């Protein structure tokens, strides 16, 4: 029942993706949008179902076709999200809030909470979304976006680029340390927090230019309105995180968390970091996934095993597959 992960694009050239077949349309009542401007934009152009509920294969196809996200990155991100936020029996994932549209729920402690669920995939120090502690981890936030604009003005000549990314990533960390007593910055989120800052430079820049300089009109169009610029061409080749090394080198951090009070950031030696990427995969499967499904029945175990094989297809060569359910 779970479809096979799509393979890479047969033709990965730049092309018009804001085309007649994929027009932007406003949200209808019930349409779900969430913390990811990429998926949101794909849904609002009909690369994904416009109500924001999709299969993993639909998501992989959409991120490749609409933005030229590369295949391994698409597979890893999509199956990680599906394993912790999606319905494994119906093969459906919400790109935002929890919804009955993903079908009958599995037993607790699984939450099938969509991408909005804090602490499974989604986490703190996002760029244009607030921390979950402050009440809303998914809607566009104007104040946070205006800080992104200010950091683009100060470090990118008015454009968002990897230098801006390195300064803003660290600012959002510092602000969470100072204000969120529950701030968590370990393991999966420690990786995605750096990766996500490269995506506007690598994937929201029109592919005919591909110069890594994102202007603020296009930025607002994607980040707030889920809308491709008029005449938007996708990137001219598959990519995801290239340049993340610049973001890390700007302000190298250790994984850690506040310990129930502000300004109490405490390094966690059990966390993976960029020196142990295989450990991040192993903890995601052995701890995060297994904690949601500690003792699955037969149909759920088979769906878990299938999606865990698919997830491993997106893991970088050199890691070893782990089997929490045999
Ligand atoms: C392949 C499947 C994808 C999944 C499952 C996914 C999921 C998510 C989630 C859950 C977040 C919230 C992260 C957090 O708060 O910890 C996020 C953030 C983000 N995603 Fe995606 N995403 C995907 C692909 C893409 C693509 C193709 C783009 C194209 C640019 C993109 C751009 C972004 C950006 C820029 C952010 C950061 C938003 C912010 O901090 O303001 N994502 N994604
Ligand atoms: C947006 O973010 C600001 C700054 O962190 C916060 O004070 C505010 O409550 C957030 N929510 C809005 C503006 O709806
Ligand atoms: C970002 O833009 C600023 C100003 O144009 C420039 O000095 C810096 O080199 C740029 N960084 C990248 C990674 O393009
Ligand atoms: C994950 O579990 C496998 C056995 O299922 C084990 O070999 C591996 O060391 C574990 N990794 C962890 C706990 O990080
Ligand atoms: Mg977040």
Curated annotation (Swiss-Prot):
Glycan-bearing residues: 11, 141, 161, 182, 286
EC number, UniProt record: 1.11.2.1
PROSITE patterns linked: HEME_HALOPEROXIDASE
Name used for this protein in its record: Aromatic peroxygenase
Catalysed reaction, written as an equation: RH + H2O2 = ROH + H2O
Family affiliation: Belongs to the chloroperoxidase family.
Organism from which the protein derives: Cyclocybe aegerita
BP GO terms, sorted: hydrogen peroxide catabolic process
